[PDB]
Every structure is written in structure tokens, then in C-alpha cells.
A paper describes a structure:
The 10mer sTIP-12 stapled-peptide had only moderate binding affinity (KD of 397 nM) for eIF4E and thus we synthesized two derivatives of this peptide with their C-termini extended to investigate if the potential interaction with the patch can improve affinity. This included a 12mer peptide with “11FR12” addition and F10L substitution (sTIP-14), and a 13mer peptide with an i, i + 4 staple (sTIP-15) around the extended “10FQR13” sequence at the C-terminus. Phenylalanine and glutamine residues characterize distinct chemical properties which are complimentary to the targeted patch on eIF4E. It is interesting to observe that sTIP-14 and sTIP-15 respectively showed a 2-fold and a 7-fold improvement (KD of 195 nM and 54 nM respectively) in binding eIF4E; the latter is clearly comparable to other good binders reported in this study. The 2-fold improvement in the KD of sTIP-14 over sTIP-12 is primarily due to a 2-fold reduction in its rate of dissociation (koff: 0.058 s–1 and 0.14 s–1 respectively). The phenylalanine residue (F11) of the added “11FR12” sequence efficiently interacts with the patch on eIF4E by forming pi-stacking interactions with aromatic residues W73, Y76 and hydrophobic interactions with L131. The last arginine (R12) is exposed to the solvent and does not appear to form any specific interactions with the protein in the crystal structure. The bound-state conformations of sTIP-10 and sTIP-14 reveal that terminal modulation of their sequences results in interesting conformational properties of the peptides. sTIP-14 was optimized with regard to the positive chemical potential at the N-terminal end which is as critical as the conserved “YXXXXLφ” motif for the peptide to recognize and interact with eIF4E.
Residue numbers in the entry:
A (entry chain A): 29 to 49, 56 to 205, 211 to 217
B (entry chain D): 1 to 12
Write the structure that this text describes.
């Protein structure tokens, strides 16, 4: 039966979508905490592939700013996916959507609590996507998140991805690899 | 809470 009042399906966490065009240029677009509200937001906004050079989207848990200096990010780091310039057409939007689904779906088992959010950088040199985690020394969590994320994106067996601490990016060698 | 399948199922 189609009810007169449809009840949405609540997500484990509330999420906030951000847009970058330094801390002046950040802008909170929208927040959501149901699956249906996620889809309504995703359906309405521009694809990452259609953004201007130097823009970012970020999706982070409610109350975490998408910046190194936030308390949940300070000690953390990121699993970085680097795309080449040709991959903008074939892979960018596809990888970004799947990243969003890994986040809102809590796809990393017990270690989804370590996940702070994700960022996509739209750049002329080549696009970048990253999952940001809260603590770079949580080796078991960082390792599990990396393996699952890489395999969810369907990245070639040949290529390796790397985890950088935000500390080493701020002063970059890989702290972990999968 | 939700599998990948369930998230997509709820895109209407
Ligand atoms: C992620 N960034 C990036 N960033 C500035 O933006 C520049 C480009 O970073 P990018 O967007 O990762 O490429 C850096 O040189 C840095 O000065 C930042 N500056 C502050 N204060 N906090 C941050 O979290 C970040
Ligand atoms: Cl994919």
C-alpha cells in the first residue's frame, strides 16, 4: 500500500555537503540524514565532472568541518585516489558517487567510526578523490577502510593507492599502501 | 544498517 505519509529511512549519521570555489571560499550546501534526502540532494546538484577547475565537493559527518585543523581531522589522514585527465569523463562521477555511498552506507564495518568524510578535487592537472579518516595511527582501521574502498571503486589490481597523514601534507610519503 | 543494494533501491 502507498501511504498518504511516506516515512524516510534514517541514515546512521547526519551528513553535510560542502562546496569549495581559503576558509572564506568554503560553503555549506545542505545537510541530510535519510537515504531519500541523500538522493534528492544528489539528483539536484551538478556532477563533479561539470564543476569549474579548482572547485571541490566534500561530504563530512555533521559537526566536522572539511579541513585539516578540525579536531576530528588534526591527527588523521586520507586515502588518496589520483585520476589522470582522461578519466574525468569515464571515472570521476562514478567514483565520487560510490565514495558517497561508502560513507552514508557505513560500508567499513566497525571502522566506519574512523571515517570523517570525503573530498573530490576538480583540477586541470588531474582530479583527486579522498576518504578522510580521524586517526592516522589507527593502523587496523586505516588498513580495513583502504582495502574495502579501493575494491568498492573497482580500481585496477595493478595500481596501488596510498594513505597520507594530514601532518605530512601540511609541511608527501605514504604511511600505508593497498 | 543498509547494504549498497538498499541505498540504491530507495532512489525513486
Ligand atoms: C585541504 N586544504 C588545502 N589548503 C590549501 O589549499 C592548497 C591546495 O590544496 P588542495 O586543494 O589539496 O590541492 C594548499 O596549498 C593549502 O594551502 C588548506 N588550508 C587549510 N588551512 N586547511 C586545509 O584543510 C587545507
Ligand atoms: Cl564504481
Amino acid at each position: 500500500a502507498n501511504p498518504e505519509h511516506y516515512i524516510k529511512h534514517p541514515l546512521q549519521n547526519r551528513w553535510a555537503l560542502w562546496f569549495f570555489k581559503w576558509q572564506a571560499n568554503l560553503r555549506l550546501i545542505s545537510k541530510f540524514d535519510t537515504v531519500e534526502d541523500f538522493w534528492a540532494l544528489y539528483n539536484h546538484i551538478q556532477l563533479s565532472s561539470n564543476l569549474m577547475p579548482g572547485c571541490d565537493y566534500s561530504l563530512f559527518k555533521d559537526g566536522i568541518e572539511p579541513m585539516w585543523e578540525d579536531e576530528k581531522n588534526k591527527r588523521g589522514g586520507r586515502w588518496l585516489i589520483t585520476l589522470n585527465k582522461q578519466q574525468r569523463r569515464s571515472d570521476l562521477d562514478r567514483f565520487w558517487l560510490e565514495t558517497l555511498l561508502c560513507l552514508i552506507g557505513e560500508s567499513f564495518d566497525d571502522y566506519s567510526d574512523d571515517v570523517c568524510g570525503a573530498v573530490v578535487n576538480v583540477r586541470a592537472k588531474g582530479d583527486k578523490i579522498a576518504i578522510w579518516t580521524t586517526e592516522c595511527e589507527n593502523r587496523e582501521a586505516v588498513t580495513h577502510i583502504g582495502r574495502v574502498y579501493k575494491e568498492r571503486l573497482g580500481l585496477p589490481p595493478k595500481i596501488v593507492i596510498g594513505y597520507q597523514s594530514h601532518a605530512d601534507t601540511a609541511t608527501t610519503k605514504n604511511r600505508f599502501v593497498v | 544498517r543498509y547494504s549498497r543494494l538498499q541505498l540504491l533501491l530507495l532512489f525513486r
